[PDB]
Point group: C2
Chain length 188, copies 2
């Protein structure tokens, strides 16, 4: 398939460019976005392509790596993606940083990778990276569960992503419960 | 007196932070009560053991004598100063009843939900992967964390370790659902 080859092209590029926004996160989010897209009857090629390049423009990437919108667009077109599809992908990644149907799917997959056991891991790695405490202040990893991560299930766009988020969100709840036991007074 | 030690020791992005020390002193003190240890010794040794650790950097790392002489200055007896110094030197060298308790407290804080957290904080602080290397957080579970339960000295610690260990397995199972092909 033209599309399979183009997906593969995009994957190698994205991996090359990038090598909590590492290739492994992007690859997980692409796989998850395609699964949700399939269930949701969204356009699979747009979902996967947007999922793969969504972080390339993100203000969080260091400046040796981060791309301009025109750089992503030109690379897509060079790789054989029609201008119309390329426009749609561009619409999604710029909105992400009403989102389109496929944009909502990608956003959902992205938020799913921020919850469950994976999201817990990513949260504590971030805290470790930025020199924040495990708990004890408003910049802490534990605070971030309450400010953000535990609310993500309410922000899911699709039924499919809402269904997947349930088990992950409940698992974060079990994780918080275990921290409350391992560490009496953690909340105060 | 234990209050004057808690102020000084408070005065680290490596896994040897204050919250960990404070956690482990409270745990040590709890375990020590069950295992009939000298609670003042346990709390003090728990509070100061990391100060001389070779894993702690040069800019912070204190010498044994500095720890001894600071303790004596806060007004500790020679008896208890020697016992504490005994404990913290036995724990802290390269290729490492009151010591057992302090060691158990320390190990326990490396497992369960809390240990998961510190492992990932560690991997983040040193720039290591979530998974994929032998140097990754996920690898450390199998290399170290999942076998800590079988290195516990006291009955009390062994019992506490069970639920923490079982939870780490639940965590790892969820992670394998979240990340297909993580192995
Ligand atoms: N204040 C915080 N404390 C702990 N983890 C965080 C914090 N902010 C973001 N994270 C986590 O770090 C990862 C990277 O997030 P970030 O780069 O800030 O936004 P995004 O990944 O959505 O572009 C995500 O899993 C996110 O949940
Ligand atoms: N390779 C690793 N990956 C993830 N976490 C680690 C690794 N090595 C140590 N840690 C974590 O950092 C903390 C401190 O461990 P370490 O300094 O090795 O032993 P100790 O402090 O008990 O002498 C612990 O929570 C431990 O699990
Ligand atoms: Ni992302
Ligand atoms: Ni320690």
């Amino acid at each position: 398939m033209t599309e399979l080859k183009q997906a593969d092209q995009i994957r190698t590029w994205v991996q090359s460019v990038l090598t909590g926004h590492d290739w492994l996160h992007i690859s997980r989010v692409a796989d998850l976005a395609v699964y949700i897209g399939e269930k949701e009857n969204a356009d699979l090629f747009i979902v996967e392509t947007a999922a793969l390049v969504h972080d390339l423009i993100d203000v969080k990437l260091p400046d040796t790596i981060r791309l301009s919108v025109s750089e992503v667009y030109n690379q897509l077109v060079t790789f054989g993606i029609g201008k119309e599809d390329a426009d749609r992908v561009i619409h999604i990644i710029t909105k992400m940083s009403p989102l389109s149907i496929e944009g909502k799917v990608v956003q959902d997959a992205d938020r799913l990778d921020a919850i469950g056991a994976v999201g817990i891991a990513r949260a504590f790695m971030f805290a470790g990276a930025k020199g924040h405490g495990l708990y004890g202040d408003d910049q802490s990893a534990y605070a971030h569960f309450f400010h953000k991560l535990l609310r993500l299930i309410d922000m899911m766009n699709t039924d499919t992503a809402r269904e997947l988020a349930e088990e992950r969100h409940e698992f974060m709840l079990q994780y918080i419960r275990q921290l409350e036991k391992d560490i009496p007074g953690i909340d105060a």
